[PDB]
Structures are given as C-alpha cells and as structure tokens.
Design a protein around this ligand. Structure first.
Ligand SMILES: CC(F)(F)CN1Cc2cc(C(F)(F)F)ncc2-c2cnc(NCc3c(F)ccc4c3CCO4)n3cnc(c23)C1=O
Length: 359
C-alpha cells in the first residue's frame, strides 16, 4: 500500500500540468523526476525519509510560455539522460538535465503542443501532438521531421494525447473531435522514411529532408466517448482512454476476437472490455498513467483523491481499485508518475503542489 510521506509547493503558484520520473536513470543513482508548470520545468531527487531535494529549473525566456508536457530520453551515443519539453509556444526544447541548458529546439506546429512521447525502442524518435490537428514524428539525432500525421482524414480538431504500442509499430491518438485514430508506423513507407531520416546529413547533401505527410489513419472511431478524449495509452493490444465522463474505458478495435494487425481502415466495430469509473472530474486536461510493467494504473480527481487500479488480473473488467486521500491534498491532480521500480508515486496539482506516496 502507499503512504503519503511528503508534500512541496512551487513558487509560481500556477498549475503543474505534468510530472515524469526519469526511467532511464542509471543503477545506484537517486530517483529523479521533472515537473512542468508556468514557463518552467524543474527537477527533483527522491531521497530516504520522504526527502525531495530541489535541483535546478529551466525557465523559458518568454514569460507567457506555458509548458504542458515533458518526456525523457537518453543521448544515443553517451547514454546521458535528456529531457524534452513543449507547450503553448509550439516549440519543442531538448534540455540537458545536468546543466538545464537548452541543447536544441524544433518548430513546425502551427499551435500549442499538448503531449510529447519518445518511441519505446528508439530514443531518437519523438512524437508531438498539437492544437493544429496534427501529430509530428521527429528524429532528434539528425534534426529531421520524419512525418506529419494529419490532413484530409486526420484529426478534425485539437489533438490532446497519443501513445505508441509496445514495439513502437503503431500510434493511437485522440482529441477534441471525440475520435481515437490508429496510425501504423511499421508500413514500408514509414520504415523507409525513418531509415532515410538517419542517413540525412545536410552538410553532405543539397536536398532538404522530405517529410512524409500521412493523410489517412489505419483505424478511426468516435463510439467510445461522447466528448473530448484527453488521454490514451496502450495496454498490450488493448487501449485505455478517457473523456470527462468520470471514466477510463478499456477497449479494442473490431470484434472481440479480431487481431489488431488484421484491422482494416474501414473497420466499423469496437469492443468494450470494461470501464473504470471514479468521482468528481468536471474539468478538462487530466492524465492517467501506468507504471513501467503496466501492473498499475493511476489517476487523480479534481479534489485531490488518487485512484490506483491493480491490472494484474485475468481480464480488464476485474481490475482492483485502491483509493489514496490526504486531508491537506484538495486541488485537482493533473498528472501522476510512478518511479521505474513502482516504489514511489508522485502527484502534481493545480495549486503548484507536489505529493509523494511511497509503497
Ligand atoms: C488560456 C490558456 F492558457 F490558454 C488556457 N489553457 C491552459 C490551461 C489552464 C487551465 C486552468 F485554468 F484550469 F488552470 N487548465 C488547463 C490548461 C491546459 C492544460 N494542459 C493543456 N495541455 C496538456 C494536456 C492535455 F492536452 C491533455 C491532458 C492533460 C494535459 C495537462 C494535464 O492533463 N492545455 C492545452 N491548452 C490549455 C491547457 C489551455 O487552453
């Protein structure tokens, strides 16, 4: 079980929209997590007796910047951790977490970036989702835009979230148009574009890097939720997604026995395997998270209550729920993050507060 061992508050007093533990931290090193809020990203180290040590922040030059998301990766030659952040300005910043120096930046999205995710098998492939209705896949080793996922049959409104499956062969995205869209990235076209992005060196060529424009998803559905879908994650071949209807739905494209890789773009069926209901969620922009092994699922509500579901059961609908409450924790929890070993759960709130729960 989890016990609340410490709380903290950031000086800006603005909501904290994101929190991510670094799952790429070396053995023996303390557990480190990043928070994003206001025009700032801050790093903290978790220590014994619930101590949370403040390290260093990156503060954006523009006081009007709002960071909405962050994600960790590592430098592909040195293994040193790297941190990517993005928000309202639509600029992806790659930060060296040691010195908090901005190493490089990527621009292209016509609007705010709602989420960043790194590929589970390739530390150089970064996915960004934006208010301009599109997803973008970048290669941060060669600084190239590999592909833009959107267009004529892509999202019709702001994209809120996206996730890669286990092998990083497909992406599921969701947003304000109420839809969930599947984009396969293991096609011959996408694997060739990724290979070409690695061979690109502008000092050694005259051509610009040609980005793929993917106008058609491999699956699309609006039958899961009746409002904006603001968070989606894969659970194997299954999908977990949530709207503002006080529920996380567990579902899969097609009929019960349909294989996810046999699903065609014209597939009109979905199968609901369960729904995890919870209380008091009226506001938009809340994220749920799973731990490294996907044994647990966590989500906070608008009054500081934490729900943790145990996914180590035969079928999704049998998930066991545990609730975590503290008399002082009363603001909306925007995101949670588990440490790689699942021994620590951090929750971040609307009042700039950070809450630590240890098993
Ligand atoms: C005038 C304005 F600043 F632009 C208003 N905001 C800022 C804002 C204000 C407030 C409040 F006032 F209540 F504190 N709440 C939410 C947002 C906000 C938050 N997070 C994203 N994106 C990331 C994102 C996501 F896409 C899906 C789930 C999710 C998150 C973060 C945590 O969970 N935002 C994108 N646009 C806004 C947000 C926005 O329009």
């Amino acid at each position: 079980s989890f016990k609340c061992v410490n709380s903290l508050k950031e000086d800006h007093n603005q909501p904290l929209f994101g929190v991510q533990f670094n799952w790429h931290s070396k053995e023996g090193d303390p557990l480190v997590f990043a928070t994003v809020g206001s025009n700032r990203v801050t790093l903290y180290e978790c220590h014994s007796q619930g101590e949370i040590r403040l390290l260093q922040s990156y503060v954006d030059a523009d006081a009007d910047e709002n960071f909405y998301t962050c994600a960790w990766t590592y430098d592909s030659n040195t293994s040193h951790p790297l941190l990517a952040v993005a928000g309202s300005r639509g600029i992806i910043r790659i930060i060296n977490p040691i010195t908090m120096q901005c190493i490089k930046h990527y621009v292209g999205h016509g609007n705010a970036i709602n989420e960043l995710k790194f590929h589970p098998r390739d530390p150089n492939l970064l996915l960004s989702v934006s208010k301009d209705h599109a997803l973008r896949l970048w290669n941060i080793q060669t600084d190239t835009l590999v592909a833009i996922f959107g267009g004529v049959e892509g999202h019709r409104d702001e994209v809120l979230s996206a996730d890669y499956d286990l092998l990083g062969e497909k992406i599921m995205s969701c947003g304000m148009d109420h839809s969930l869209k599947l984009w396969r990235i293991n096609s011959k076209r996408m694997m060739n574009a990724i290979k070409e992005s690695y061979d690109y060196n502008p000092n050694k060529t005259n051509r610009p890097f040609i980005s793929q424009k993917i106008h058609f998803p491999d699956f699309s559905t609006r039958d899961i939720h009746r409002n904006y879908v603001d968070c989606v994650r894969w659970l194997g071949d299954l999908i977990l997604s949530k709207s503002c209807e006080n529920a996380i739905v567990c579902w899969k494209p097609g009929k019960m026995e349909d294989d996810i890789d046999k699903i065609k773009p014209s597939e009109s069926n979905v199968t609901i395997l369960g729904r995890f209901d919870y209380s008091q969620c009226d506001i938009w922009y809340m994220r749920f998270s799973t731990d490294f092994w996907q044994k647990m699922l966590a989500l906070g509500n608008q009054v500081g209550k934490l729900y943790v579901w145990d996914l180590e059961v035969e079928d999704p609908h049998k998930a066991k729920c545990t609730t975590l409450t503290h008399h002082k924790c009363g603001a909306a929890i925007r995101q949670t993050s588990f440490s790689r070993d699942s021994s620590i759960l951090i929750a971040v709130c609307d009042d700039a507060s950070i809450w630590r729960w240890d098993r």
